[PDB]
Ligand SMILES: CC(C)C[C@H](CP(=O)(O)[C@@H](N)CCc1ccccc1)C(=O)N[C@@H](Cc1c[nH]c2ccccc12)C(N)=O
Ligand SMILES: *[C@@H]1O[C@H](CO)[C@@H](O[C@@H]2O[C@H](CO)[C@@H](O)[C@H](O)[C@H]2NC(C)=O)[C@H](O)[C@H]1NC(C)=O
Ligand SMILES: *[C@@H]1O[C@H](CO)[C@@H](O[C@@H]2O[C@H](CO)[C@@H](O)[C@H](O)[C@H]2NC(C)=O)[C@H](O)[C@H]1NC(C)=O
Ligand SMILES: *[C@@H]1O[C@H](CO)[C@@H](O)[C@H](O)[C@H]1NC(C)=O
Ligand SMILES: *[C@@H]1O[C@H](CO)[C@@H](O)[C@H](O)[C@H]1NC(C)=O
């Protein structure tokens with residue numbers, strides 16, 4: 086099949102031909118920011134493998150207007166190509182008159198043009214507000230995975246690595262940025278200038294970046310002499326201080342850790358006003374949402390600091406994992422994403438131990454397990470075809486699970502030997518691609534006995550879901566049963582590395598497991614045992630017999646006799662098994678008693694988090710009797726810890742997190758004191774007019790409480806357009822959405838659609854925010870459902886925005902009716918809409934919810950009433 090105008094397409098696969106091979110791109114881009122469009126040309130040094138009559142590469146929404154091929158030897162300079170477009174595959178065919186010669190280089194060259202992108206992809210247009218209120222424009226590129234083809238025609242696959250030499254024409258008012266340092270700038274006739282950037286090292290197309298803006302920067306040098314710069318709106322340079330501080334510390338770390346220098350001479354980090362992704366690891370020119378990069382001490386909280394540190398860590402980890410060593414294809418995207426996600430941990434634990442990220446890491450794995458316990462889940466490494474399916478590859482499986490199995494592997498292998506694996510892997514594939522298999526070979530190959538580790542992880546990456554390790558203890562015998570953990574299978578089996586402890590010795594006994602079942606002995610008929618120490622392994626464990634009761638009991642007495650991460654694990658698993666049917670809800674609720682003793686914030690916040698969830702499920706239905714006793718059990722129990730909370734910014738990171746956590750809970754639950762203090766602080770802030778200062782850690786709590794009055798809601802909204810801290814704006818918007826008036830919420834949404842006051846990039850989260858609230862769950866469903874067509878103009882399905890707009894408004898549903906409506910809406914989508922994997926997940930999720938209610942609801946009712954007694 087073929088098009089556009091009659092004829093044919095010499096090639097049919099959406100994968101590209103391996104015959105033509107790019108070695109270098111001379112790229113010239115001439116953008117106009119008043120005209121809001123660009124004009125550009127390129128010259129690709131090709132190498133022909135087998136002889137051909139046609140050249141196939143990617144192009145999209147690019148008006149190509151002059152195709153030639155030149156002869157370094159064949160012919161002279163030169164000859165003209167016939168250009169053939171085929172949109173349904175985002176390809177174009179270049180037709181040669183004289184068949185090409187194997188083993189000879191050529192130069193494809195063309196002139197193309199288009200308008201600057203209209204939303205977050207390819208070479209698009211963004212704006213921002215200045216302190217004076219001036220609206221300003223920049224042109225920025227975002228290409229992963231398949232948008233480079235919208236900027237310049239090219240062999241747009243991660244394998245087709247090449248060097249890139251980029252030139253940009255610009256006005257005097259702007260600067261031009263790109264992957265590589267600027268070699269020279271040359272004055273042109275009509276007063277124009279032309280930046281010439283140093284040729285890039287070999288790199289995939291999705292990492293090519295360029296920006297013309299009037300931004301401001303702060304610069305510094307790492308030990309190995311790299312110039313790191315933080316670019317941002319001129320009026321925001323003050324917020325770039327931490328980023329620079331962290332940037333250097335991290336790049337340094339990574340160089341030492343990977344034993345590989347950052348190749349380039351400079352690394353820029355730039356804060357983009359309108360930025361869809363969280364950030365992008367463009368080699369040498371990493372782009373960020375302002376909330377991912379900018380920090381303001383007067384307005385950015387403790388967790389904020391931890392956020393931007395984390396995301397900075399993530400992106401620098403990419404320069405090695407992803408940039409230097411790139412996956413062959415988007416099926417193995419996890420090799421880039423899972424590792425970056427993991428290095429966040431390592432790199433931040435190393436350079437910033439005081440941020441206590443180590444205790445926050447289990448959340449990563451927990452978050453994904455929620456979805457990995459559904460049938461509709463998928464294996465880390467899975468096939469991907471159409472762009473949409475490639476986009477879909479970016480999720481908590483590729484990221485969280487990916488990072489979580491490595492953390493398992495590292496534990497199995499010890500830091501050093503694991504580290505050695507990664508030094509070798511990155512070195513072995515520098516400036517080239519790699520495949521899932523390639524990795525495991527290097528991680529296990531750090532006499533004559535061998536690491537078959539490959540066998541082990543290969544199953545971890547190739548099969549969906551998470552294992553449930555059952556354990557029976559008849560005296561000194563332990564039955565070991567493995568299952569596919571499900572939320573209430575046949576064929577699954579993992580080589581799952583076991584860990585455990587006895588009540589006797591806190592000494593850690595390791596072990597393996599490769600068969601459907603085995604058994605182990607116990608050198609002491611002991612009280613309890615605790616499998617999976619610190620939850621370092623990607624599996625759930627359920628104790629048969631008195632195992633669950635003894636372990637719980639232990640916590641009720643000397644709770645300190647169990648590792649804190651062991652606690653967090655017990656707490657996490659106990660409730661998961663309730664949803665699995667392997668436990669009865671009151672046993673979980675009966676564990677949350679020792680939380681009166683618990684001082685380790687991680688564990689205390691984990692337990693509390695579940696009780697807080699139940700409240701919100703109850704509160705989302707009109708289940709008043711339960712939701713209320715639930716409220717009054719949190720206010721009475723935990724009254725000690727709640728009352729110790731200062732409305733300040735003092736103590737450690739976990740101190741500050743605990744405070745914000747607790748204080749939010751109280752104000753959520755309408756605790757008289759709490760809501761009177763926040764109302765006070767707020768009224769002061771307003772009646773003083775910004776002059777007074779709310780501690781950052783309560784900034785959101787305060788704004789949200791002040792949001793309840795219409796005077797406050799209007800002030801907060803008006804102060805939303807005036808703020809120069811996007812982190813504050815973030816908190817104001819959340820507060821704006823804790824309102825009870827449908828029109829106030831509706832307005833926020835409508836303003837979001839418009840994307841003038843509230844940037845488009847925030848629509849997904851905003852919609853999500855509103856939906857969680859009882860007063861707003863219907864409104865959102867209505868909206869998404871009704872305006873779905875206009876939503877698909879703005880976003881891709883499945884862009885994270887759309888995927889998130891969907892689940893954000895439905896996943897929390899828990900009634901048969903809603904399941905019908907949603908089931909029926911996903912149906913409607915059966916056209917340009919259908920299909921997305923998210924459809925399944927959501928449905929399986931809404932059903933998991935209904936069943937949890939039926940299987941466990943009344944139990945909640947009486948465990949709570951049993952307490953009110
Ligand atoms: C991880 C964080 C530091 C930012 C990260 C940047 P990157 O370094 O992972 C980049 N390479 C991905 C950019 C991208 C995202 C989605 C589709 C195509 C291309 C991210 O993905 N962004 C958003 C949105 C998102 C994409 N996949 C996800 C998987 C799970 C959760 C969120 C996301 C975010 N908030 O992480
Ligand atoms: C983009 O287009 C604008 C006009 O829309 C160009 O600006 C004009 O350029 C000509 C030629 O130098 C001058 O005679 C005018 O005085 C300019 N007007 C203004 C207000 O700038 C601009 O040079 C173009 N930008 C680029 C970099 O191509
Ligand atoms: C394309 O990029 C590669 C790197 O992937 C460049 O190769 C380096 O070139 C320098 C200068 O000649 C050598 O000293 C290094 O040994 C090369 N590095 C490696 C690891 O190969 C190459 O120079 C670039 N090509 C062009 C045309 O500039
Ligand atoms: C090109 O030549 C190689 C070497 O024989 C051959 O294996 C390959 O199939 C050819 N590629 C195509 C299909 O043009
Ligand atoms: C964090 O860093 C410390 C050294 O400061 C190291 O001993 C520890 O193993 C690291 N933690 C983890 C779990 O990676």
Ligand SMILES: *[C@@H]1O[C@H](CO)[C@@H](O)[C@H](O)[C@H]1NC(C)=O
Pocket residue numbers: 642643644645646
């Ligand atoms: C709990 O156990 C710890 C560790 O031995 C001990 O220090 C403490 O005295 C015990 N507390 C109680 C409540 O018995």
Ligand SMILES: [Zn+2]
Pocket residue numbers: 399403421422425426
């Ligand atoms: Zn990433």
